[PDB]
Design brief:
part of a larger assembly, 2 chains, B: mainly beta, 1 helix, elongated, RNA-binding, rRNA-binding (chain B), ribosomal protein (chain B), Small ribosomal subunit protein uS12 (chain B), rRNA binding (chain B)
Chain lengths: 131, 136
Amino acid sequence: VMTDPIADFLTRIRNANMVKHETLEVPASKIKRDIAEILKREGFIRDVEYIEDDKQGVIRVFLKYGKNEERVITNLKRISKPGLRAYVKADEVPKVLNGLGIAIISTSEGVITDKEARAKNIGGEVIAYVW
Amino acid sequence: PTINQLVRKPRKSKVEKSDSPALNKGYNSFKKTQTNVNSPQKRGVCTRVGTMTPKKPNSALRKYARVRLSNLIEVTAYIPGIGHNLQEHSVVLLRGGRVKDLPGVRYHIVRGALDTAGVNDRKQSRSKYGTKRPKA
RNA sequence: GAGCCAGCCGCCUAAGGUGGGAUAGAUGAUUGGGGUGAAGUCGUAACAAGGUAGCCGUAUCGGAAGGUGCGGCUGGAUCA
RNA sequence: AGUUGGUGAGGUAACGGCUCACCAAGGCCACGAUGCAUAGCCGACCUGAGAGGGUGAUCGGCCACACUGGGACUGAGACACGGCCCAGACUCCUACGGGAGGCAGCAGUAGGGAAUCUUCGGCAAUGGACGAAAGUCUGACCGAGCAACGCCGCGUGAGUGAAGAAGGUUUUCGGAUCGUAAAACUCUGUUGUUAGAGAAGAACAAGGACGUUAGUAACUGAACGUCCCCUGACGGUAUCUAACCAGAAAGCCACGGCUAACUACGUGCCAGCAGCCGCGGUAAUACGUAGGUGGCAAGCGUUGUCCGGAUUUAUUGGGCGUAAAGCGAGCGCAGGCGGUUUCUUAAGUCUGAUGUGAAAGCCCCCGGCUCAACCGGGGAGGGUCAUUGGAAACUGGGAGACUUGAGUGCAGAAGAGGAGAGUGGAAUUCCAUGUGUAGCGGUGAAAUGCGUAGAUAUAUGGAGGAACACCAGUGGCGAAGGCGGCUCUCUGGUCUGUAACUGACGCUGAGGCUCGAAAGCGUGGGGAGCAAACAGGAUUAGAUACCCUGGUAGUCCACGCCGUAAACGAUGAGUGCUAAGUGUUGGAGGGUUUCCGCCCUUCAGUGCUGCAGCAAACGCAUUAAGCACUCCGCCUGGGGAGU
């Protein structure tokens, strides 16, 4: 039984990236769209576009590559996996690779990156890393 | 294991042993009681002194003396240095330290520190073996 | 006279006696297995197809190592 | 079994089974009751990158005990640390009738132990008790004394000084090193000794005078302000000054690798050494002395103990093909985890204010002893705490809506899936009869054996039990163990199509229950072959074994029992994603079509090759041992022993 869909989304991206092809289809829902957006602004995902018929689905995502054929997004990792949720207070906000990476947190005012948290003194639940 | 298991399972450890039990007496007075006495030494009476043979591949005649510690437990210790004065019925101290080329003994006495006499010739490392500096 | 006290009686209970049990430790003729020991007497199961392929469960036998029978495996050489 | 609750009474500073009489049968337990065992608890200290782990001695807070066990009186306050009464063990005095006693207060004594001090001075300060005040008491306390036990500071001198004095040690006998090290000269006194000078710790009650402000008829006084006056255990102590002397003041461990620092002489698997590797049987950098060198230095080594390095209990931070480790497999209560969307609430979550987290500690700033320990002031840190205000993404709780997961309907397909009831042929063997004559059978070689009471062979018929030749295939079905002659009655599961229908009804699953090869047990049957035990024959030094001739239980049937295998793919289960090629069992669609013989698309199993990735290699790779989440089981050096 699919019991953790955000992890599935990240794993799909990691798979489709490691073999180096370009598009990707995933059943759509509330937060998946949001983390897709966040991953798009930062210069990680080339483009997304939302398409829906009668149910979930479907967030198509076109990956991004370097001109010299090298991968920009280099890995992915979930943190607050079910069974053990992980929270962080404002004076604990993680910070991956001394800035060269980002992490994504679910503040009580929405889903934002980490710098946007420390510029606001909020905590919340952390979803995932990426670098 | 899954985190939920360690929740419902203790996840213990493997508590270590000691290398010199006779130095933590299993008490005996007035009513033969339990241990908190992890001393650095004790004493006893030499019940007999002789020599014994080591195991292969070494070869010698190691000089030993069986003792009886005050806390009513038997022990077969070792004596260092060249020569000695130990004979039957003599009080002496016991310093903890194992000796590997011989099996059965894990304590050896301290030289000069008690009834036993210090070694009588050494001139270089007399701290051990209990030899007073020669003042001519 | 009221009121009070010494003395006497009554319930409660520490130590004590008796009884059947519970439980921990030393100790004992004799006995069961284990480890170690320098050179012992007996045989040679396994390692090559170790000279009857090994192994596992099981029943029986025998100075001992082991043999035998049923069922199972390949982590079996050789081989059409 | 006063246990739990109730009615009533009694009682206590005070509510209450605290105690009594009556009534009813409750209470707590897997979220660990009851029992057994160890420990006084905290501020803190030690270690660690950190999470943590281990200790609760000096200093502060609390609790509890006073020779062992009971009881209460006086009192605001005790069931009372130098108080009383009773019982008990111990010590002491009697004139025998009877009495006395409790250093776990400060010193000291015996005993135990590896191991821990003076039977000191003084109320000068601070604090207490009584007193109107002087004052008295104060082993609290302040000081003195002992112990390198800990931490901090300072000496055992400094400048110049060589072709290397003497001597050691060694040597290719040339020298080399100890070494500017010594010598010799020029200086200093922290230190030592002496003689002088020499404090801070002291603020005061009391007593004298002198006022002011409340109260009176008034002043005696009170409550504070101003001045004289009064006292040191430490102790002539800290401290300063002047004189004199290089003079009185360095040991300890180690030198083969880990590890910094090498050569002689001595002994010869003896003496001996070692934390681990290991050295020692004739030229030892490892044993012993000598001489050099290195590390620390008023200290240095050895033992004992706690944390580290240990990612070796893996939350940060490990693993299960063959190295230790997936239960033999299922069914499933409890539990852990959960599809997508609207509104809602605000337990979990983040955030704000207040209280609170003793003092001394660790840390930050500042300051005082000639610096340092130390001392002083001021700040932060620590809660999972309590109250109160916000936000609404995530998880949870409430009212909803959906259809992909799950399931049901309708239409089809395959199968050694199971139980019960009968039935077929071939073969081996025993029996009946005809023929038939001397052998059969067995081995590497032989023998034992059956035969002239006619054997083997051969032909005809009868009996009985067991297993199913060919089809048979890396084929099929089952959850696993496993299921193959044929036909019938009962009966389970899987797969493809359609998309009627309910609306997340799911997954996994400790304890429990079910199934469970072969061998084995019980009761009753049946018994052809085969065969543990056993007998005989052989080979062999021996052969209770391999080879040969016989043969009992067993192997089969019914109902019970046991519950184990290398029960294996040594590979737990659910679910989703990531190149290809090649066969094969069962399907559904589309073209060619006589396709029922090709070609194309797709679902489900089932094999071989192979790319990313992974792996210590061997290898695995859409039937992952790749990438990831959920739930379960298991492991932590080899023996001792699954004892």
